[PDB]
């Protein structure tokens, strides 16, 4: 499940433009524990920066911070 | 009274009365139509007869009434900025706006200048409707060259949101003579700006530059700005295009002016291609540049030593040429002993 | 260095499958294969698992074979070793022939796919030697090229382009590159872009792949058509180039043919007029006239007199008689 979402997200990252909606939709389906989702977000951020998509990275890092906080609460 | 009534036909036939009554404080009317014409600022392009465009219509068909309607549009534009590109679209789609792009300028003059509002409206269109931006770009560049050609911000807007299909459309527009995005006196600064953009943005910028009729010699100073760890997109595109050039002395000088880094294969790549296709001309250029700098001497000699080591995998004669042998012999004496030893195999 | 000295004893003692699973559990640690920097590669190959490769450099091969079945990443670990040790790749041939299928090409593809999934940097550093030492199992189609362009970034793309231009990397042969690009037409957008950039790095004549114009659809293949347009705009048309440009069917949104014809006519007017004269006098006639009418419409925004050249005019005058009346009126303004 998570590997398929990762494959689709990587396909989206390697496209031109700023259509980030599908990336967010696929991210909202990442299953597993919160640490698994943190690692998933980190890999997505790494690829996005491999393509220098900086504001997409800003948004993904907002996501990462919120997940970190909810994991700290749990 | 004439606004609280505000089917489409009744609405436009009333908006006309609104304008006619205006023709004999408009901020409050602007606020009320700002609220009443929401849900019309939603797509915009189809795959024209709305009540707001009626105002545009009047402005296209109408002296002091002209200024009055321009102030009304100014007030609504202050309340609703999207109006901006909705005007541009109108001036491109309506038959009433045939030969009246000038209106936009006067619109920009009546706002609370042309360059400012054009940049702002193109940015809003990029944020709201990428298809409309793509379809407006040719006419915006053609009608406002003095406000778009020197603008890296507009090109940034465009290359940020386009995909491969829209890039191909823009390329065909350029090659069919319908679109000009660069001019020789400003393209170099724009590409220097470009080196800070995202990956696909730089790829698109270079593909667009290649569609134009601007010689690479115009932008060849950008080589002094390209760092091999930071600008692989531009280095890729520029290398693949430098392949096809008969090299100038300035081009070889700019290539040799890149700092020597063992992990950077750009200089050896292009020098190998040129020496395989234009051995005598490249030897002449290298001899001239070696004698002129006597870009440092040792930089040139290290680049040539890298090329000499590389050329052993293909049969050739480039370093057996009289010009570069003459240059090496002429220039050995200016090195210090450490560099005389560093380049001993080359100086032989 | 302790378990290395022990591993030489393990190898010197000679079922090995239970031992293979024991070695899998014990070698779990090293499964980045590359160091961050000469001595780097030697220290890299100094680990235990590589001593068995060093010993192999037949009963050892079945231990490796049994090790492979359990740990598949062993395959590219072998390849890296055979490139990172002064201690060329014949050992990989023997190792691939021991697998269940035994097919060297397939074992190579599986190991390269595992490496692409597990470390893109190692794949990028192995690609030149894999193409050079196994050209036959790599050049004849674009499966490996597809693997590579699917994960590379702009930096690795520029590095591969430099490897090609420096003579240390061959990814296409002239006898297979056309079919490889044709099958690549099904790949992702950036994959196609990088494939075209690498092809351009190879300096293979555009004439070799210009037949691909029969497969390029304007709505479906904008990357390939973009690159091909930007490359063709720098060539002196060669008759076959114009022939394949004109063999594209006319569609309302397809602008490729008109753009390239406009460029060619505006800087190679007489040569293009001659090519079109010869093609008209010899792809259908009305399709050529149709492209010519599109070009005539486009040229009204300029001032060039390409249609005043007498080759074109006389070819039109001569061939009007061979059109039916419906097409005589369809192209009236051109025939005039």
Cβ within 8 Å, pair C189-A51: no
Statement to judge: residues C2 and C82 lie in one domain: yes
Classify residue C243: in a domain, yes or no: yes
- For residues B266 and B258, is the Cβ–Cβ distance under 8 A? yes
Residues of A with CB below 8 A from B160's CB? 17-18
Experimental technique of record: X-ray
Q: At what angle do helices C222-232 and C256-267 cross, to 10 degrees?
A: 10
CA distance C67 to C327: 72
Statement to judge: residues B116 and B23 lie in one domain: yes
Statement to judge: residues C63 and C74 lie in one domain: yes
Cβ within 8 Å, pair B207-C189: no
Classify residue B250: in a domain, yes or no: no
Characterise B138 by phi-psi region: left (phi > 0), alpha (psi -120 to 50), beta (else): alpha
Kindly compute the dihedral angle of the four CA atoms of residues C3, C9, C13, C14, in this order, to the nearest 10 degrees. Answer: 80
Write out the two tokens for C121. 């940097």
C282 touches chain B (CB under 8 A): no
- Taking CB atoms within 8 Å and a gap of at least 24, the contacts of B163-167 are B163/A15, B163/A16, B163/A17, B163/C189, B164/A16, B164/C189, B164/C193, B164/C222, B164/C223, B164/C226, B165/C219, B165/C222, B166/B130, B166/B134, B167/A16, B167/B204, B167/B207, B167/B208, B167/C222, B167/C226
Statement to judge: residues C13 and C60 lie in one domain: yes
**Pure H helices in C185-298:** 189-201, 206-209, 222-232, 240-246, 256-267, 269-281, 285-298
Using the 3D structure, point to which of C219, C234, C249 is the last residue of a domain.
C234
CA distance B23 to B63: 11
**Pure H helices in B162-231:** 164-175, 187-194, 199-210, 216-219
DSSP strands (E only) in C24-73: none
Kindly compute the dihedral angle of the four CA atoms of residues B173, B179, B183, B184, in this order, to the nearest 10 degrees. Answer: 30
Which residues is chain A interrupted after (C–N above 2.5 Å)?
none
Neighbouring chains to C with at least 3 Cβ pairs closer than 8 Å = A, B
Whole domain around residue A11: which residue ranges?
Answer: 2-73
CB atoms within 10 A of CB B168: 26
Statement to judge: residues C217 and C274 lie in one domain: no
CA distance B159 to B191: 13
Write out the two tokens for A41. 């977000």
Q: At what angle do helices B232-242 and C154-165 cross, to 10 degrees?
A: 30
- For residues C293 and C332, is the Cβ–Cβ distance under 8 A? no
Classify residue B91: in a domain, yes or no: yes
CB atoms within 10 A of CB C136: 9
Residues of B with CB below 8 A from C154's CB? 199, 203, 232-233, 236
The closest CB to that of B199, out of A17, A18, A51, belongs to: A51
Cβ–Cβ pairs < 8 A, chains A and B = 27
SS3 state of residue B232: helix
Minimal Cα distance from B195: which residue of A?
A: A52
CA distance C121 to C123: 5
Statement to judge: residues C299 and C281 lie in one domain: yes
CA distance C334 to C319: 12
- For residues A37 and A70, is the Cβ–Cβ distance under 8 A? no
**3-class SS shares of chain A: helix, strand, coil, % to 5:** 75, 0, 25
The closest CB to that of C162, out of B178, B207, B266, belongs to: B266
Statement to judge: residues C24 and C65 lie in one domain: yes
Q: Where do we find the tokens 């930007």? A: C230
A17 touches chain C (CB under 8 A): no
CA distance C178 to B222: 35
**What DSSP character marks residue C215?**
T
Using the 3D structure, point to which of B129, B148, B167 is the last residue of a domain.
B148
- For residues C212 and C224, is the Cβ–Cβ distance under 8 A? yes
CA distance C135 to C157: 20
Classify residue C131: in a domain, yes or no: no
- φ/ψ of B97, rounded to 5, equals -90, 20
Number of domains in chain A: 1
Q: Looking at CA atoms only, how far is residue B37 from chain C in angstroms?
A: 34
Closest to B34 in 3D by CA, of B68, B85, B4, B78: B78
Q: Where do we find the tokens 């240390």? A: C168
**What DSSP character marks residue B332?**
G
CA distance B219 to B192: 9
Statement to judge: residues B42 and B58 lie in one domain: yes
User: Which run of H or of E encompasses C329?
Assistant: helix C325-330
CA distance C43 to C329: 80
A51 touches chain C (CB under 8 A): yes
Classify residue B311: in a domain, yes or no: yes
Query: How far from C8 is each of A14, B206, C86, CA to CA, in Å?
Result: 46, 56, 19
Statement to judge: residues B160 and B232 lie in one domain: yes
User: Mind giving me the DSSP string for C1-28?
Assistant: -HHHHHHHHHHHT---HHHHHHHHHHT-
Number of domains in chain C: 3
- Taking CB atoms within 8 Å and a gap of at least 24, the contacts of B6-13 are B6/B33, B6/B36, B6/B51, B8/B49, B8/B50, B8/B51, B11/B51, B12/B49, B12/B50, B12/B51, B12/B54
Whole domain around residue B53: which residue ranges?
Answer: 1-148
CB atoms within 10 A of CB C183: 14
Statement to judge: residues B4 and B91 lie in one domain: yes
Statement to judge: residues B104 and B198 lie in one domain: no
Using the 3D structure, point to which of B110, B128, B148 is the last residue of a domain.
B148
Statement to judge: residues B75 and B132 lie in one domain: yes
- For residues B198 and A53, is the Cβ–Cβ distance under 8 A? yes
Resolution (A): 2.4
């Amino acid at each position: 499940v998570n590997t398929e979402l990762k494959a689709q997200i990587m396909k989206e990252i390697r496209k031109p433009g700023r259509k980030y909606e599908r990336i967010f939709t696929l991210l909202k389906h990442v299953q597993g524990s919160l640490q698994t989702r943190l690692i998933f977000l980190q890999n997505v951020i790494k690829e996005a920066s491999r393509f220098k998509k900086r504001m997409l990275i800003e948004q993904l890092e907002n996501f990462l911070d919120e997940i970190h906080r909810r994991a700290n609460q749990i | 009274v004439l606004q609280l009534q505000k089917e489409a036909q009744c609405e436009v036939m009333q908006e006309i009365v609104d304008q006619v009554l205006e023709e004999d404080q408009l901020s409050v009317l602007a606020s009320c139509l700002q609220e009443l014409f929401k849900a019309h600022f939603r797509e915009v392009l189809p795959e024209v007869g709305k009540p707001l465009y009626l105002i545009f219509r009047n402005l296209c068909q109408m002296n002091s009434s002209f200024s009055l309607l321009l102030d009304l549009l100014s007030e609504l534009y202050q309340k609703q900025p999207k109006i901006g590109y909705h005007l541009l679209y109108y001036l491109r789609a309506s038959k009433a706006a045939a030969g009246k792009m000038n209106l936009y300028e006067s619109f920009a003059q009546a706002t609370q200048d042309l360059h400012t509002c054009l940049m702002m409206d193109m940015k809003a269109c990029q944020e709201d409707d990428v298809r409309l931006l793509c379809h407006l770009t040719p006419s915006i560049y053609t009608e406002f060259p003095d406000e778009t050609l020197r603008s890296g911000e507009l090109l940034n807007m465009i290359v940020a949101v386009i995909d491969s299909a829209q890039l191909q459309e823009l390329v065909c527009h350029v090659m069919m003579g319908n679109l000009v995005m660069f001019r020789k006196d400003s393209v170099l600064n724009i590409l220097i700006q470009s080196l800070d953009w995202e990956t696909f943005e730089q790829y698109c910028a270079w593909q667009l530059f290649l569609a134009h009729n601007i010689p690479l010699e115009t932008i060849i100073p950008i080589l002094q700005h390209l760092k091999y760890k930071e600008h692989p997109e531009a280095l890729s595109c520029l290398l693949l295009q430098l392949r096809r050039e008969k090299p100038s002395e300035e081009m070889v000088k700019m290539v040799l002016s890149r700092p020597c880094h063992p992990d950077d294969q750009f200089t050896t790549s292009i020098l190998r291609h040129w020496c395989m296709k234009h051995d005598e001309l490249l030897a002449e250029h290298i001899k001239s540049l070696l004698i002129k700098n006597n870009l440092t001497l040792e930089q040139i000699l290290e680049h040539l030593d890298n090329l000499r080591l590389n050329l052993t995998n293909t049969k050739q004669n480039f370093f057996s040429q009289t010009p570069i042998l003459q240059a090496l012999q002429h220039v050995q004496a200016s090195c210090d002993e450490a560099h005389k030893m560093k380049f001993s195999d080359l100086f032989s």
